[PDB]
Amino acid sequence: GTVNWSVEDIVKGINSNNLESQLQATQAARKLLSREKQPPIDNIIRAGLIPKFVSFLGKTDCSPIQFESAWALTNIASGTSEQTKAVVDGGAIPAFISLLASPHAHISEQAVWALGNIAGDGSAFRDLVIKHGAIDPLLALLAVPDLSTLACGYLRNLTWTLSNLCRNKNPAPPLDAVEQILPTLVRLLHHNDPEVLADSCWAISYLTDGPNERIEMVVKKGVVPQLVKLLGATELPIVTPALRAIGNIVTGTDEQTQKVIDAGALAVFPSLLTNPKTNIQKEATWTMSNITAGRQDQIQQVVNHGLVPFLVGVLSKADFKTQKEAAWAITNYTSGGTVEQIVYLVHCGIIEPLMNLLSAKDTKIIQVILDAISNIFQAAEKLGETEKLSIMIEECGGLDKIEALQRHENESVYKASLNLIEKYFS
Template identity: 40%
Template structure:
């Protein structure tokens, strides 16, 4: 008989792919987030700040005549485009800041350094650092009675933080973090905005710099800035910058301790209802980062009651789908109770729609989340089957050219097979799962081969059990042969991976006995029937007879 496995456990079943503990899950998530961590993406580091009028193509020409033989800080004004400020003026700027007590001279020196750092390519960040002016710029952040000067100094420091990791470390070592955190309390909105920008750039560089901001109370200060109501509510542009900075404080491996960042969850939850798409996007990314890891991190997010809103955002028209999907995936990688919360919120319907997206990452992430749900209880697996999400998984994702999407889709099939439920097998066979599985036997990825071989093994066991019980011939075996699966299995006898070789060998020996005289594989039955009538349901749990087409 074909025995069903017990699925009454309360934890995720062993032997299926999950992302609960460090080994597989953290590494997989870390790989998936590498493109986000890249300093080349302005979603993480806003490298420089430029006002529209300062972009060289739109900049108004300065009315000042610049004599290259007689440069001074007053050879330029606020309308001078950054590309028109020569590096030769840098020593004059440093002298004005460090040696001249006149406020206007100091301001002009800071202004020009900021412009020097605002060019799009090859900004002289190291040259500015080498002058020793960084401590003086940091000191200017504390001139509470001169917000314009504070703003320019913060702007210059922000652009330094947008340089290399070593440049950011230089700022940390010079003591920049605490003055920037304090600047968030400025009554000047522009100073708050620039402080948040600088802190976000610093936090986004590495775990070390992120922790420096966290230890200085940066997260709490950003939250207080967002939630400030008196004397007036915080402007939208400041909230936007603070939310982005919080998302950077929540990310990068190793993840910050949950007790350090969970204070942000109530505010982030409310920000998910913002009418500003950028705020929603960064808040959702922050929540996805916080939920990533052991089950207690997902539980902290679930406890806010935000999962229904996260599920709503799976159908959003913008790029907010990805962080919402990652949050859903993180929750399905936790306990069965956490997975059930996602199911109860109605996630399966929008997830099914996401599999028709053209973006590879969306389809890969969706299949990963589905594979985690199917690794739960049999009731949860049945919910997935009844949602018909396996139709696009089998007929699209399992056959697509993107290898990583196919791998996740294969895990979905494999995890469902672990229950060894006849209805599940018949449902997948009716969807035509055997041909794409056989095609996958020709792939070079050893992990995919292992998953496919294990799945084919249990499908063949099922087909054999049905045939031995008098319900017709072994149509699974016929489907494998007709889809070149037998040839592929024989070819895998030469595979360099010992485990792959053994799996293929066991399948051949158990299902395709060799003729003693001729030495070739013998299969029962000459002509494929195409259809088979099994006792049981083919639609995720319905009872009663149905026809199932294997190929």
């Protein structure tokens, strides 16, 4: 008889001095907040029930009311930032951290969920939860020989809460906290459950989004092989975070990019650059562009894996954002590549699609394309072959696009097009 209660009855029951009346009222409140039709969180907050739930969180003798209040506060902290702030202002962080060590698995799981919802609000509440000392109990909950002995849902919730503790920036998670969490996160990254894998991979992608110091921190744990293995997975929820993490890693030093390459990541890109999902193609092309901005030996490893034809294909037909990432990749290739590599580019058939891409409203893509065409023309000069390249660019209908860009609102575009016209077409 706790279904479809009024906030008035719940308030009257909780305000009584009868622990059982309070328990039934809190259960009614939980059921009201556990509905799928927009829970009445604001009504429960305006009634002043959060402090009473926070107090119930500490009644060890009555574990049912602890569980009910934890569920209710978890659902309240799942809403807007203001509702999570109301939960935190009730003093719920320390109460949930204390319940993390409860002998009842369901109560501890609800505490993990509540702390995860709180930390997911932003950097401020995340760092506050970390200051209150939640990392040590959370990791102690996972300190077991084999993770497979834990319940699937419990482990998934723990993984999600940790990933939220690794999330958000400005500021990024504390360095000590990341060092304390990484071992368990890597242990979870090798688990067999797809949801745990996806969440731990998202956490790793979070930790690798930043300065090269954090990327080095993550890479020192030896996760690049596992990340590449997950990159070749069949489930998109696992491939997406893996690709994001690989991309973040290759945005760092050339040595970290080489660590990625040595793990065999390039061998997976033939299918990533042809993935039916647009986001996968876009982020794979972005990763390829960051790889082509590396050393010449890395460009040569890209060439050896036969990925230049796939970039040509992406430039020929793909979403405009993927095509722009491919143009950036080609520009970096030509800017850092050897003459033989810049010639292999044309031998693969880049000129025609790269020229067809010049007839776009986006100005930055035009600047990138014209820089790439300047670099290729310089590579041709270096072999006394500019004339044949010019005839090629004029045959495919590009010269018309180059001379049309001589009039353009942006200045650098028309300046570069005029330079090219007067320097290689006379």
